[PDB]
Amino acid sequence: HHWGYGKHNGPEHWHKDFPIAKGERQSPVDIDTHTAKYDPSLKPLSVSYDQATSLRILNNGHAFLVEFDDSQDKAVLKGGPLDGTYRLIQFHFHWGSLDGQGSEHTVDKKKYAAELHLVHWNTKYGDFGKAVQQPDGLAVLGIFLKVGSAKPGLQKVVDVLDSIKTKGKSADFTNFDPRGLLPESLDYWTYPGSLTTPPLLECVTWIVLKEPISVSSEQVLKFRKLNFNGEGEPEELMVDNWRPAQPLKNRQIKASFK
Ligand SMILES: [Zn+2]
């Protein structure tokens, strides 16, 4: 018994256990493309994933995560609005029950079928646990997914989902190249925010790419066959595991492009 995305434990209930849910820099938010400010001082993003080492893929009952070895600077994110090096620790998705919903961030109110989050932590803080307690501890790269052509680089992930159908299941997942999930362009918006799942800490510096990647209906369909529940109990399909847009309040979204 805890938090989830159902009617009685969904996002609207999270604030009771995690007061920060009504905080000043909560995520996701709607990106108003006409209010975003182009900032010439923003540097190009630097993604160095050539030595990435994936370890496992896990169903934690809220989504499925693909965990990486973050004991060294093997897969890092630098540049952009960041100061220092951020190490990739895991990536996961949020998706919907239908192609018209699923993303957490929205663009001019437009919702995408899913959203990919690549989570990185600031190496100055040693470890993930310490990083989440700092305002500049995390840097999450957000990528939108739209239904269309199949994404070859995502197929290895969809084919193993059958092995981690229920909450608690994990499987070995080595030699996966996260570079296959990136779009052509690295243009982005960025704003200070939080983790979109409890405990909703406001330690994120969000970097949302403008260009979405396309995945096939067959690929996204497989995401929808996962279960929120553990093996041996009422089957609840894992769908609509997204938090709705939160108030922007005293924050401005910057764009790396004109
Ligand atoms: Zn996420």
Side-chain angles (χ1 to χ4, degrees):
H1 182 304
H2 243 289
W3 69 275
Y5 298 88
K7 185 184 64 176
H8 290 290
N9 66 355
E12 302 311 311
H13 290 278
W14 299 356
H15 75 86
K16 286 175 283 183
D17 291 298
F18 307 96
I20 198 168
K22 301 183 183 303
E24 301 292 350
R25 54 179 280 183
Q26 286 294 292
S27 299
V29 295
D30 172 58
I31 300 300
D32 185 305
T33 64
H34 300 99
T35 301
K37 180 169 174 55
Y38 170 55
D39 181 310
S41 67
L42 283 175
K43 310 180 187 62
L45 273 177
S46 174
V47 182
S48 301
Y49 293 167
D50 44 295
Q51 295 287 165
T53 300
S54 60
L55 298 171
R56 305 169 336 137
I57 187 183
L58 169 270
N59 176 339
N60 68 1
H62 307 121
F64 67 81
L65 292 288
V66 169
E67 308 180 16
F68 290 72
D69 164 24
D70 67 337
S71 61
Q72 303 184 66
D73 284 0
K74 288 187 171 187
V76 304
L77 182 61
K78 300 173 182 176
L82 308 173
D83 295 303
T85 305
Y86 288 68
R87 289 181 190 170
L88 172 66
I89 176 167
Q90 57 104 320
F91 74 69
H92 57 275
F93 304 80
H94 309 262
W95 61 91
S97 49
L98 299 168
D99 294 358
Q101 57 187 51
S103 67
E104 298 205 304
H105 291 81
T106 55
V107 182
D108 289 326
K109 302 287 188 174
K110 173 175 170 47
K111 296 176 182 176
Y112 285 96
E115 187 173 323
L116 165 63
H117 289 164
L118 288 121
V119 187
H120 310 72
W121 55 274
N122 196 322
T123 61
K124 84 169 69 168
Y125 296 123
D127 66 61
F128 183 77
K130 297 311 298 292
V132 297
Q133 306 184 60
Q134 307 302 319
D136 63 333
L138 291 190
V140 182
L141 190 65
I143 300 74
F144 294 121
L145 275 68
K146 69 179 184 181
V147 178
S149 300
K151 187 74 173 182
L154 175 67
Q155 202 56 43
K156 288 187 180 182
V157 174
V158 294
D159 287 325
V160 303
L161 299 182
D162 303 285
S163 67
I164 58 166
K165 188 175 183 179
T166 51
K167 178 178 182 179
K169 298 284 193 177
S170 69
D172 297 67
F173 196 63
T174 57
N175 302 101
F176 178 73
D177 195 329
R179 287 174 297 187
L181 305 171
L182 303 175
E184 211 163 59
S185 172
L186 294 188
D187 288 328
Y188 63 86
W189 299 288
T190 182
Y191 74 98
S194 72
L195 298 157
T196 68
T197 56
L200 301 167
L201 301 176
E202 306 184 316
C203 59
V204 181
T205 275
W206 274 97
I207 300 83
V208 180
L209 302 185
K210 171 178 60 63
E211 186 188 325
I213 58 168
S214 298
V215 296
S216 65
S217 54
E218 299 95 310
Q219 294 182 305
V220 64
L221 283 178
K222 292 186 179 181
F223 281 23
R224 300 177 187 147
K225 290 189 179 181
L226 293 172
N227 292 170
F228 278 126
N229 59 283
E231 171 171 46
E233 59 191 13
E235 173 170 45
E236 294 181 296
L237 296 178
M238 184 179 279
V239 290
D240 295 313
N241 54 354
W242 50 275
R243 181 192 197 189
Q246 302 300 302
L248 185 58
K249 296 185 175 178
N250 185 184
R251 293 180 288 176
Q252 290 193 299
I253 297 73
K254 305 291 188 55
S256 73
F257 57 103
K258 51 185 293 186

